[PDB]
């Protein structure tokens, strides 16, 4: 699975993590098994307009 | 053997923070086994907790949960609580109260009968 988020947001998107984007976008169960890769990419998904 | 585990209790806790888990137990066994947690780290692998013996003679606690766990068990009702002591903000996980059916735990690999699991997590 894909997704991009914020950096303020690294901590937010967490097995057992709440807010807007823990709760309301992207859910980990407690026992989850595999990884998550977060890389920034400023370059490309975020316009200098 | 067949053996049926009531096991109750729970909630939120918070960073030093304390449970009063419970474990009633109930059915036949092969051996009067030794009731306790059999809890793993959210993600982790199943870890043994805290033992508490049926005659309430034998007690066990690990590196990772001393300081801030303790078993016992009721002498009424025969319900096993885990009595708390400043719980840190790194126990959300899930605890489940396996039964050990043989009178000494040589090793706590082997599990005879599982029980219940207890999902409580630590924040404010």
């Known amino acids: 699975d894909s997704f991009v988020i914020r950096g303020n947001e690294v901590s937010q998107i967490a097995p057992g993590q709440t807010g807007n984007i823990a709760d309301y976008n992207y859910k980990l169960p407690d026992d989850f098994t595999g990884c998550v890769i977060a890389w920034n990419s400023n370059k490309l998904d975020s316009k200098v307009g | 053997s067949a053996v049926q585990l009531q096991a109750s209790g729970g909630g939120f806790v918070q960073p030093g923070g304390s449970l009063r888990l419970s474990c009633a137990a109930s059915?036949?066994?092969?051996?009067?086994?030794?009731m306790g947690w059999f809890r793993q780290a959210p993600g982790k692998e199943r870890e043994f907790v805290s033992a508490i013996d049926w005659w309430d003679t034998v007690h066990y606690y690990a590196d990772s949960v001393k300081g801030r766990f303790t078993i016992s068990r009721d002498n009424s009702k025969n319900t096993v609580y885990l009595q708390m002591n400043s719980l840190r903000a790194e126990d959300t996980a899930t605890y489940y109260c396996?039964?050990?059916?043989?009178?000494?735990?040589?090793?706590?690999?082997?599990?005879?009968?599982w029980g219940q699991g207890t999902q409580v997590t630590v924040s404010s």
């Open positions: 396996a039964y050990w059916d043989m009178d000494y735990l040589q090793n706590s690999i082997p599990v005879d009968y």
């Open positions: 059915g036949w066994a092969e051996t009067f086994g030794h």
